[PDB]
Structures are given as C-alpha cells and as structure tokens.
C-alpha cells in the first residue's frame, strides 16, 4: 500500500510531468507493442497497430487519462477505478499480466522524458502506485 510519503511523491511528480501525459501515453503504448509484440492481439480488431499511429495516439491519451484519474483517486484506487476495471474485465478482457508490461514501459518513457525528476525515490513510489492501479484494474475480473 501507499504511505503518506508515497502518496506525496506521486502527487508532486504528476504536478511536474502532468502536462506531457499525451507524450507519455503515445510513447508508452507505442513502446509496448514494439518490445512486447504479443500484446497487440488485444488490438487485432484495429486497422493501425503501430507506434505514432492515430489510434496508438488514441488509446494512449485514454490510458494516461486513467493514470491522471488514478492520481486523483490515489486514496482509493479500488473505488476510483471500478468504472474502468469492469471495462477491462468484461469488455476488453485484458490479461492483467500485460499491466506489468505497460507499467514498465511508462517508467522507461518517464525516464527518457524527465531524467532529473524521476529519482529513485520517485521511482519506488510510482512503481508502488502503478502496481496499485494494476490491482485496481483487476478488481472485477474474478
């Protein structure tokens, strides 16, 4: 779980990087389908599964918007994301293991983009948070 310390670190970092969430999202989801190609099966219904494409730029804005929301519901991810959680269970049926993968790719993008800000202490808090979101997304699966 996230300590008051952890909640604080995530809030100040987002305060900082929040503006470029669109760059994070595009970059992260893009990175995702390139380095872990097996995750593209969930986008097998689409016409343009490649980095930078309109849709990756599309699913990207949404995902970081979920993170933005998650920062906002950081005191209760379970309640805060039950809306999104039932979507990935029943509507998308994404194997949660893939959340781990996305979480890695976002940490890497943020390190490329905000090397000064993404210190080890911020890192541990964010990783703890994204695990926290990953669990929250899993809430309605089984």
């Amino acid at each position: 779980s996230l300590s008051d310390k952890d909640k604080a670190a995530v809030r100040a970092l987002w305060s900082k990087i929040g503006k470029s969430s669109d760059a994070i999202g595009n970059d992260a989801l893009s990175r995702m389908i390139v380095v872990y190609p097996q995750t593209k099966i969930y986008f097998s219904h689409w016409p343009d599964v490649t980095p930078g494409s309109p849709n990756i730029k599309a699913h990207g804005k949404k995902v970081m918007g979920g993170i933005a929301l998650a920062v906002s519901k950081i005191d209760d991810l379970k309640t805060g994301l039950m809306e999104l959680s039932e979507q990935h269970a029943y509507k998308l049926r994404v194997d949660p293991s893939n959340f781990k993968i996305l979480n890695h790719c976002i940490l890497v993008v943020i390190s490329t983009m905000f090397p000064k800000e993404f210190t080890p202490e911020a890192h541990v808090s964010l990783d703890k948070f994204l695990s926290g979101v990953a669990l929250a997304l899993a809430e309605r699966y089984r």
Partner: peptide
C-alpha cells in the same frame, strides 16, 4: 497467434 490471436501468458 496469427489466426486465433490469443495472449501467450
């Protein structure tokens, strides 16, 4: 993968 598109995990 190419015809059933199942997540290997």
């Amino acid at each position: 993968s190419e015809k059933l598109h199942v997540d290997p995990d």
